[PDB]
Design a protein around this ligand. Structure first.
Ligand SMILES: Nc1nc2c(ncn2[C@@H]2O[C@H](COP(=O)(O)OP(=O)(O)NP(=O)(O)O)[C@@H](O)[C@H]2O)c(=O)[nH]1
Ligand SMILES: Nc1nc2c(ncn2[C@@H]2O[C@H](COP(=O)(O)OP(=O)(O)NP(=O)(O)O)[C@@H](O)[C@H]2O)c(=O)[nH]1
Ligand SMILES: [Mg+2]
Ligand SMILES: [Mg+2]
Lengths: 302, 274
């Protein structure tokens, strides 16, 4: 209230909703976003109305992008070392989004910081999946970060049960004293219950330290469905009383969407979980952390 | 009055469904005024409003998937070169083998060329695919110039008189000019009879910009929308057809070689619509 207060707000709220949608925010997220602005603004100069919703939207977008506390991988690995157990990380996501490429980027980063990593080749299905990992392991061994071993690929070819390989890889990792295990998994659609179950088994059987959903910033409304479905298998198929869920997000192909940046919000909206990494290209250094201001700035200018 | 409210009611419902099928919001707003022009509440006698409106919506979607250009087809006995382009991860390499297998079971002399000199495992992947399907392949673990590979592959399979010569290329995006130039050099080199832009059905609002730039750089003539298995909507395909001035020829419905069928419009739009 008042009625033409609400009337002016909703009319400019609508222009903002159609703006976030055009920039690849998931429509129903764009909708829920504005309805939240309404509740916050209502009860309390047309330009001020425009500027008050524009300003208030911007404030919430920033809060959505950075929930909880920033994830601190190198610090948490140290805790794993103190307990003398590998810090285990699982990558999952749908077909094609950049799981295997971005796992390599991340290990480069870990390796340069002095940590040994065992890459578990647990996409035993898709053709090439293991040669492709193998090429990266051979290139990462060049970092040397000679005596001892900093990168090794743990692999058993194709055809075998990825939840079992991942258990072996971790046990091997603990046995050889590797700091980190990076578990690659195979691309799977989120409505494919077999694949969704097998993923859930790999996770609940092995209980990694960190489960990382990989999403591409090119996805549209499926950004929400992928994440909802992945978290539902993880929850539905857990054996623990405490359901193990997705810990964070790697958002890839951020260099392909220009300013249509809105997939960052679809994914930070539906989880209270952070974007740990941004993929900004196809090479080892194309790994950024997410800048909320730069994202929200992009989302307003269009 | 009642009729206006009814029409605005169905239309809002159509438009919300269309946006969540990942249609470009500009397309959705345009269709909305297109159906409003094409419908007159006043002429409607007592008949049912909804059914005429649903038809009106559905008829305007059908215009959007039809580019009005007939899809290209290979010609028996001649050397048909087909080139695959698309964004990173869009499904190009898997679809190459699907299209080859499609044509090989229909009695065509098909082969495959991996000319992706960048992606780790690009040859292995295509090689393994091709081997599992008994389809001849060509590539190199050592060569790094994809124009050389695509040239040597195309000529080799022609001297062996193949009918379907499918070239797989690396994933590339529009804002990477060196890749988009390399793509131009591969096309000019092998002179393909048909370029296939491949798009992931889960693509969002960025589709029109990418797809347009692929068509501005190279004569895209066809479209294949991948990852339409099960529940995917694939509304970006409208931007893709309009941007590339090309028809959608097939759809990919899974990771296996036989998860592949020719594109048909009505069922695609029915899934899109509801
Ligand atoms: N431009 C760009 N391309 C990227 C990025 N991350 C990954 N890619 C590209 O995406 C494509 C697929 O990468 P890949 O690691 O195979 O993805 P995946 O999730 O492991 N695919 P699969 O499910 O088939 O195993 C490759 O062309 C890779 O170079 C990124 O941040 N930017
Ligand atoms: N479910 C499903 N998965 C598909 C379909 N088409 C391809 N895929 C999967 O999605 C990924 C596509 O990989 P790929 O064929 O490498 O695509 P690409 O365009 O060649 N990638 P790159 O840019 O690296 O060359 C693979 O994981 C493949 O198994 C489809 O129709 N359905
Ligand atoms: Mg992979
Ligand atoms: Mg490929």
């Amino acid at each position: 209230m008042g009625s033409l207060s609400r009337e002016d707000m909703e009319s400019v709220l609508d222009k903002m909703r159609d703006h976030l949608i055009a920039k690849n925010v998931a429509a129903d997220i764009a909708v829920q976003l504005c309805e939240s602005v309404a509740n916050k603004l209502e009860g309390k100069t047309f330009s001020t109305v425009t500027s008050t919703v524009k300003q208030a939207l911007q404030e919430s977008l920033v809060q959505i992008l950075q929930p909880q506390r920033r994830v601190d991988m190198l610090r948490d690995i140290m805790d794993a070392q103190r307990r003398q157990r590998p810090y285990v990380v699982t990558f999952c996501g749908v077909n094609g989004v950049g799981k295997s490429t971005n796992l390599a980027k991340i290990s480069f980063w870990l390796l340069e910081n002095g940590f040994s990593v065992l890459i578990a080749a647990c996409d035993t299905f898709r053709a090439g999946a293991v040669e492709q990992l193998r090429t990266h392991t051979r290139r990462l061994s060049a970092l040397h970060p000679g005596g001892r071993t900093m990168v090794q690929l743990f692999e058993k070819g194709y055809g075998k049960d990825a939840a079992g390989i991942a258990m072996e890889a971790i046990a091997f990792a603990r046995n050889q004293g590797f700091d980190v295990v990076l578990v690659d998994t195979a691309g799977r659609m989120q409505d494919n219950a077999p694949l969704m179950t097998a993923l859930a088994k790999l996770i609940t059987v092995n209980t990694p330290d960190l489960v990382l959903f990989v999403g591409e910033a090119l996805v549209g409304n499926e950004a929400v469905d992928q994440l909802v479905k992945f978290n539902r298998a993880l929850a539905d198929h857990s054996m623990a009383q405490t359901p193990r869920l997705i810990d964070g997000i790697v958002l890839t192909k951020f260099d392909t969407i220009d300013d249509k940046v809105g997939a960052a919000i679809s994914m930070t909206y539906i989880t209270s979980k952070p974007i740990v990494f941004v993929g900004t290209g196809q090479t080892y250094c194309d790994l950024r952390s997410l800048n909320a201001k730069a994202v929200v700035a992009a989302l307003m200018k269009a | 009055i009642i009729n206006e409210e009814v029409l605005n009611a169905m239309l809002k419902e159509v438009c919300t469904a269309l946006l969540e099928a990942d249609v470009n919001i500009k397309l959705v707003k345009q269709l909305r005024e297109n159906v409003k022009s094409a419908i007159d509440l006043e002429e409607m006698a007592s008949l049912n409003k909804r059914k005429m409106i649903q038809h009106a919506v559905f008829k305007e979607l059908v215009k959007l998937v039809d580019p009005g250009v007939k899809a290209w087809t290979p010609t028996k006995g001649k050397q048909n070169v087909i080139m695959f382009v698309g964004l990173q991860g869009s499904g190009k390499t898997t679809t190459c083998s699907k299209l080859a297998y499609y044509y090989q079971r229909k009695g065509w002399k098909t082969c495959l060329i991996c000319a992706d000199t960048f992606r780790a495992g690009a040859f292995d992947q295509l090689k393994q695919n091709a081997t599992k399907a008994r389809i001849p392949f060509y590539g190199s673990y050592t060569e790094m110039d994809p124009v050389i590979i695509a040239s040597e592959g195309v000529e080799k399979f022609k001297n062996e008189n193949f009918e379907i010569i499918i070239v797989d290329t690396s994933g590339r995006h529009k804002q990477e000019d060196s890749l988009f130039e390399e793509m131009l050099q591969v096309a000019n080199a092998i002179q393909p009879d048909n370029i296939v832009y491949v798009m992931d059905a889960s693509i969002g609002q960025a589709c029109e910009a990418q797809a347009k730039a692929f068509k501005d750089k190279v004569d895209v003539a066809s479209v294949i929308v991948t990852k339409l298995d099960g529940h995917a909507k694939g509304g970006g395909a409208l931007s893709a057809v309009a941007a590339t001035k090309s028809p959608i020829i097939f759809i990919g419905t899974g990771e296996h070689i036989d998860d592949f069928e020719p594109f048909k419009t009505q069922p695609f739009i029915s899934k899109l619509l509801g």
